[PDB]
């Protein structure tokens, strides 16, 4: 059959230009006489239509989004791209590219939704701090250790333990808004205290927006 895949960055700054490209595999753009469009959906809100295109220069746009949508089709690369201008804080939505069998009817297939939102200027790399276990950090035969992800922007970050080898007892907590713009979270794993001084535990925090693969080793606290 045919399938549509989106690409491009998941981030854009306010008052900038958005570049989202949706590619076509298993089919041809020009043949068949069908249509393309872009459909966005904010989290917790209904679907919103942006604009529709033909493989020729025929275009039509939402009057709410009029004079801000620039969509172009290149047949040689077998894809179509949409450009959005003057993006704001209210444009955080999940974008979908879909094939239009009937222009005034329905869409046969929907591509997977990329979380393309706006990203404020507060963008900064994360600051990973180890969480050293101690005698007061354990309750019984098991202890806890982890790493703190503080002062980063934007969502999300992926934290893995021992390159994904340690999954049991690993808890990932959702981020919360700090007092000044940024977020903070942590990821911890419950481990018996017998292997505290004999096993090495390292937290792998990845921040794809700010290209940050900080690896921090977790050790028991040393009194100074």
């Amino acid at each position: 059959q045919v399938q549509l895949q989106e690409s491009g960055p998941g981030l854009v700054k306010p008052s900038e230009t958005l570049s989202l490209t949706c590619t076509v595999s298993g089919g041809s753009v020009s043949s068949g006489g069908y249509f393309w469009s872009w459909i966005r959906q904010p989290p917790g809100k209904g679907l919103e239509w942006i604009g529709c295109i033909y493989y020729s220069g025929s275009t039509n746009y939402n009057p709410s989004l009029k004079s801000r949508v620039t969509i172009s089709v290149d047949t040689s690369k077998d894809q179509f791209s949409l450009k959005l201008s003057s993006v704001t804080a209210a444009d955080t939505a999940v974008y979908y590219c879909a094939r239009q069998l009937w222009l005034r009817g329905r869409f046969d297939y929907w591509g997977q939704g990329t979380l393309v939102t706006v990203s404020s200027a507060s963008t900064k790399g994360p600051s990973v701090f180890p969480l050293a276990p101690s005698s007061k950090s354990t309750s019984g035969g098991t202890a806890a250790l982890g790493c703190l992800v503080k002062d980063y922007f934007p969502e999300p970050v992926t934290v893995s333990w021992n390159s994904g080898a340690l999954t049991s007892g690993v808890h990932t907590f959702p981020a919360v808004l700090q007092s000044s713009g940024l977020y903070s979270l942590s990821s911890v794993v419950t481990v018996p205290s017998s292997s505290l001084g004999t096993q090495t535990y390292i937290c792998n925090v990845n921040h794809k927006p700010s290209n940050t693969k900080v690896d921090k080793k977790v050790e028991p606290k040393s009194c100074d």
Binding site: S37, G46, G113, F129, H171, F173, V176
Partner: protein, 213 residues
């Protein structure tokens, strides 16, 4: 200025029948094709019906739609509900040159066990202190119900400035887990003799303490 009106919340017990409406504002509902998309949360929308009476190949027979042109409303009737129908249904009318999607209709039908609030504490690391920051992290995990109140303490005085906490979240243990963060300056962390986190859960209080060592 044509907008589709759809109820925000519709709930019905499984096995019964329910009617989902979609009212057009200015244009008549019989003028243009009305289509319903059934979208799972965190997934791409999928067409569940089209042409106001035509079913796609693959969906069951219960997804039936009807048009009441006198009341300018599009009706979608579902019979015999069950678990996987918990999705979002948007009535779609492209009309001409502009898809007007509907507001959307969700579904709501209805074992978390009671548990003890295990609490762990860590002091700020030396690397954070060298980077002129200090943060005390309080963690609440393996508990239920997910309604806990955190209260930081500096020896005996409660601390509210810089306190950031997380809402309880679901895990694989069928219990809840939360977090609490106390941002502090390096001089404030060493000013007090000890810092403690107190967690209240179902009346019982579990308190851990840390000291600068």
């Amino acid at each position: 200025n044509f907008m589709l009106t759809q109820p925000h919340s519709v709930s019905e017990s499984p096995g019964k029948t329910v009617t989902i409406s979609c009212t057009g504002s200015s244009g008549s509902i019989a003028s243009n094709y009305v289509q319903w998309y059934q979208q799972r949360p965190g997934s791409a929308p999928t067409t569940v019906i089209y042409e106001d009476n035509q079913r796609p190949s693959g969906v069951p027979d219960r997804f039936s739609g009807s048009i009441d042109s006198s009341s300018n409303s599009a009706s979608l009737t579902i019979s015999g509900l069950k678990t996987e129908d918990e999705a979002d249904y948007y009535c779609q009318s492209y009309d001409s040159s502009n898809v007007v999607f509907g507001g959307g209709t969700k579904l709501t039908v209805l074992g978390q066990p009671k548990a003890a609030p295990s609490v762990t504490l860590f002091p700020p690391s030396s690397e954070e202190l060298q980077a002129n920051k200090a943060t005390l992290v309080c963690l609440i995990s393996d508990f239920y119900p997910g309604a806990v109140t955190v209260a930081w303490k500096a020896d005996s005085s409660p601390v509210k400035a810089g306190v950031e906490t997380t809402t309880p979240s679901k895990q694989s243990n069928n219990k809840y887990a939360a977090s609490s963060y106390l941002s502090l300056t390096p001089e404030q962390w060493k000013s007090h003799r000890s810092y403690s986190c107190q967690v209240t859960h179902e009346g019982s209080t579990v308190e851990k303490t840390v000291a600068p060592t």
